[PDB]
Structure formats: C-alpha cells, structure tokens
C-alpha cells in the first residue's frame, strides 16, 4: 500500500563494533575511532574490522524507509496521529512506548478509520 | 536403459584467488572431457547445479540444489569460471557438480 520505490539496498548491513569490545568487558561496542599510533584498525591493515565512512551512505531515494516502504513517525495521541491523514502512503505511525493500553486502543481505532498504518499494533494488548 | 544422465560431470576445484587472497564470488570448475579453452567455449552460458542432501525435509524433499552458470574460461587447460546465486560453501572443494546442456545452441 506504500508509494512505489526502487529496490532498497544497504551497503553495509553489519553493525560497526568497536575494536576489542569482544576482548574486554569494560569496552562497550558503541563505535569509537582508534586514535592510537600503532593501531592496525586505524592503519587499515588487511583482515581487520572495517570503519564507518561516507561511502557507505544509503541512497537518498531510499533513505529512512522501512522495508514496508514508509517512514516511521512517532505518535502519542489522536491529534499527533491525525497529522498523517493526507500522507498515508509515505508515513507509517508508531505508537510511543509510554502510551497506556486504553489510549492505544483509541489510537488503533482512529488509525484504522483513517487508513493509517501502525507499525506496532500489538503493544500492551491483552488476550 | 541403465543410464539416464543428461548432464556433464564436473568438479568444484576452488575459488578465484591470488596467492593469499581468495574471492568466493567466482568458483572454478573442472568439466571432465575438456582440456583446452577452445573446447571449453562450447560450455559457456550453461547452467550448473550443485545437488546435495540434508536431514530436514523442507518442501517435500531432503535434496537441495544451488544454481549457477558458466561465465568464462580459465587458464589454458579447460577450467571454467562459474557464478552462483549463493556462493558455493567451500567445503565442496573437490565435490561433484552438474553441468546441464541447456541453454543449447545446437
């Protein structure tokens, strides 16, 4: 039901992890650049981890798009949901994590009436 | 009869490689019978199937196929280069593989 788009390509689908985050527990795997003077990762030796750079950037016709073909838009209530009334084929709503269930049923009902896609229509639901 | 083979046997030799860096995207195939690039030019564009077995039945069969094709000749001795949809798993170095006669020009 989305707008037609070219085939979505990710140039590097693997997550860039910090060197020796597997080695030490004190080293988190959020990316940091090696500024050492003898670092094999900084010197880009063969067989080491690759580094983030601008050449891995996604296509501008394809960027910020979900695999369904929409862009995620965070919503908190019905008035935030109603902003996507004329833009249903480009944006998909996502209910925020801190919305209660008795409000979530209202947002899902209004989105189903307006034809808006919700990317998480299963949070805090009881059965 | 007793034989039903409509393909040519071949062996998966290795990947395309230098002395110390290999490239899994291109595989090297020894087709039996051919010993020169001029005879190997007949087999360009032919489909190749690697046919193997697994324990878990997926869609009615325990036999899984990996498809590819011959692209060009390699060397002076009739080895050919082959590309597959997913690359060959490199434990199949020396494994048998099937070169079909289609798409035929004869």
């Amino acid at each position: 039901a989305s707008l037609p788009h070219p085939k979505i390509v990710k140039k590097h689908t693997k997550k860039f992890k910090r060197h020796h985050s597997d080695r030490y527990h004190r080293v988190a795997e959020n990316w940091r650049k090696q500024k050492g003077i003898d670092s094999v990762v900084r010197r880009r030796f063969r067989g080491n981890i690759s580094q983030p750079k601008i050449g891995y950037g996604s296509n501008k016709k394809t960027k910020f798009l979900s695999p369904s073909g929409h862009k995620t838009f965070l919503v908190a209530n019905v008035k935030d949901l109603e902003t996507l009334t004329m833009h249903t084929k480009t944006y998909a709503a996502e209910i925020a994590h801190n919305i209660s269930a008795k409000n979530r049923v209202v947002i899902l009902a209004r989105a189903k009436a307006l034809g808006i896609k919700v990317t998480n229509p299963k949070g805090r639901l009881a059965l | 009869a007793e034989s039903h083979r409509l393909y040519v046997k071949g062996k998966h030799l290795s990947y395309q490689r230098s002395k110390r860096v290999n490239n899994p995207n291109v595989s090297l195939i020894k087709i039996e019978g051919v010993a020169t690039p001029q005879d190997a030019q007949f087999y360009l564009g032919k489909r190749i199937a690697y046919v193997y077995r697994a324990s878990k039945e997926v869609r009615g069969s325990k036999i899984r196929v990996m498809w590819g094709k011959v692209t060009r000749t390699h060397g002076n001795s009739g080895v050919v280069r082959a590309t597959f949809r997913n690359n060959l798993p490199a434990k199949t170095f020396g494994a048998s593989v099937r070169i079909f006669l289609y798409p035929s020009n004869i």
Partner: protein, 197 residues
C-alpha cells in the same frame, strides 16, 4: 572418471608422481599406489643415501621423541614426499590425505584389479638415457627397512599366480578373436565397417 585409481609405482619418479597424485587427491580422485618399493629417484645411490643421512641428522635436541620422524619404509618415504605437497595441517588437507593409501607390493584387495601408470612421471620417458637413478627399496633397506625380502617372496608368489591367470585369459581372447574374425565379412559386419565399427 574412476572411483579408485590403482597406480603401479614401478619405474616412476618420486617427486613427479607425488606432484601428480597430490593434485589428484586435492581434486577429489581416490588413489591407491601399489609396489612402492620399485620407485625411482634420479641421481646416484650414494647421493640419495647422503641426502637421507642429512635428513636423519635432524631431530629435536631436548627430546628426540617430538622431533621429525624419519620413516624408513618406501611407502612412508613416498607419503613424506606427498605430504610435503599437500597442505596437510588444514581440514581440506586431512580430507585429501584420507583418500590415499600406499603399499609395498600389491595386497590382495588390489592384486585382482587393474594397475595404471602416469606417463609424465615414468623414468624411461623423463630421464635422458645414461643418467643414473636409484631404487627406493634398495635405499630404504640401506637406511633401515626390515622387510625387503618378505615382500620379494610375496611378489614372486603373486607373479606366479598372475601368470597362471594370464595364460587362461590369453587362450580365451584368442578364441574370441577367432570367432569374431570368422563371424566378420557378413552383412552386419560390412554395415558396421561402413559405419565405422
């Protein structure tokens, strides 16, 4: 082309045969090499004995048990020359080397099978006439192999049995060739001759 290829090792050169056979195993052909005591090495017997003594000197100093093992049988000498040409320390190398078995003489699994040769490793086709060569069985029994004469006696017995086989085979094929010649020059024979058979 074959399930198992049985190579008669007599009159072959060790390095050229090993470089043929190692590539065959790495391509996935099963090879069994028989009569390993009749391999040939180019060069004088004294040169190759000196070469083996230079190899035999090499051992680990603090413990000889973990050093290089100097195997004395001709088949194990061939196995050493072939393991030098296979990358044996990987899983692919181990899987290749388990497709090979090398024997002195021709054991009873393989005495009734067909033996082949490798013409690009044959001594009479490779060496210039006049160059000197060695016999691997003679070199191996000079450096310590104990079973040169029992292999000779077993090979004499096997050759007697094989000649008894071959006399019957020759008589049968002469009968078949006689019947084929007398049943030739018929209409089916002339049609097959026109068609090339």
């Amino acid at each position: 082309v074959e399930p198992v290829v049985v190579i008669d090792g007599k009159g072959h050169l060790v390095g050229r045969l090993a470089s043929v056979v190692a590539k065959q195993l790495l391509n996935g052909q099963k090879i069994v090499v028989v009569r390993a005591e009749e391999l040939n090495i180019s060069g004088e017997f004294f040169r190759n004995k000196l070469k083996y003594h230079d190899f035999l000197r090499k051992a680990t100093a603090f413990n000889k048990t973990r050093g290089p093992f100097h195997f004395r049988a001709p088949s194990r000498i061939f196995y050493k020359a072939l393991r030098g040409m296979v990358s044996h320390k990987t899983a692919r190398g181990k899987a290749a080397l388990e497709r090979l078995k090398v024997f002195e003489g021709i054991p009873p699994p393989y005495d009734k099978k067909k033996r082949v040769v490798v013409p690009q490793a044959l001594r009479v086709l490779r060496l210039k006439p006049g160059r000197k060569y060695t016999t691997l069985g003679k070199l191996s029994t000079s450096v310590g192999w104990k079973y040169e004469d029992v292999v000779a006696k077993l090979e004499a017995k096997r050759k007697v049995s094989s000649a008894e086989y071959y006399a019957k085979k020759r008589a049968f094929t002469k009968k078949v060739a006689s019947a084929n010649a007398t049943a030739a020059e018929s209409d089916v024979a002339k049609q097959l001759a026109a068609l090339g058979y």
